[PDB]
Target: Linear precursor of pseudoxylallemycin A
Amino acid sequence: LFLF
Model:
């Protein structure tokens, strides 16, 4: 998961 990438929560930038």
Notes: The chain has no helices and no strands.
